[PDB]
Amino acid sequence: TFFNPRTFGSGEADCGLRPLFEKKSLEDKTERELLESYID
Amino acid sequence: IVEGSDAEIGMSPWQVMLFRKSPQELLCGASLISDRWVLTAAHCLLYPPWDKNFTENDLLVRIGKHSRTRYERNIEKISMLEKIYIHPRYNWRENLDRDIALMKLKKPVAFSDYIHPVCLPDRETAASLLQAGYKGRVTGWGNLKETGQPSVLQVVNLPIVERPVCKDSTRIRITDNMFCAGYKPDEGKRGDACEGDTGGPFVMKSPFNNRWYQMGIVSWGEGCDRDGKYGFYTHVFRLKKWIQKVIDQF
Ligand SMILES: *C[C@@](*)(O)[C@H](CCCNC(N)=[NH2+])NC(=O)[C@@H]1CCCN1C(=O)[C@H](N)Cc1ccccc1
């Protein structure tokens, strides 16, 4: 937690995790492209 | 987005649409960073040559959207703005240096399957992920080509390009507050952001914790998807102190 939620509001703790993907352990159709770019 | 494809439903739940009240029109993209803060490009809101100097009252934010044109009942949420903040050193006259703005929502939005905030990078994540050759993702409802407009949110993945290549691709003066992304002529693949995509997020997924981080903001380019040309993005981590100040103080 970087920002103060009193002024930032809620959502930082759970940021960046998508309900329909990460949260369902489902991969989206192209995100493997991103992951594979790190091996390169 | 040129040479991208349709987003999957909920693929980019931090995507925001800035919408003008009257005349009713799509203005640009933006990203949700908390329940009440939205991040976008300054030039969306302030660019006097194009008669853009919007106040809080001219605009609304539409969050959770897929369709560009349809009102999506029970899926999208619309909020008004309490306040707009542009970076005080935003340079619209020359090169769009520090093309960044924050918008505080009048009331927080409820999160849903379709609405959820993106993370902003820390130093280690910025150092680790913002490297030449690594790919991030850009989303928007902007033009499909140089001018048309898509029925639904578009998505494209693009490699970060080395500073010397970015510099030599253009006669516009680039700064450390920008990075460029896109395929080189020798890489064969294509894709770019375009007009209408400004303000939309350039995100990357961390292999360390599986979270999406917003590294950039669609800012500028010369044409769209041209060989030997690259899209430029506001370097979010470089301006995170400003982001922090604004949020902490207001
Ligand atoms: C405002 C945004 O919709 C748009 C994003 C364009 C992204 N294009 C690509 N290929 N990734 N930005 C612009 O249209 C900006 C705003 C002002 C003019 N502009 C340009 O990109 C010009 N084409 C070039 C430029 C002019 C002045 C200063 C910087 C860049």
Ligand SMILES: *[C@@H]1O[C@H](CO)[C@@H](O)[C@H](O)[C@H]1NC(C)=O
């Ligand atoms: C745009 O609006 C402000 C007030 O919000 C005004 O004072 C200013 O002169 C305008 N900015 C520019 C750069 O013209």
Ligand code: NA
């Ligand atoms: Na190009």
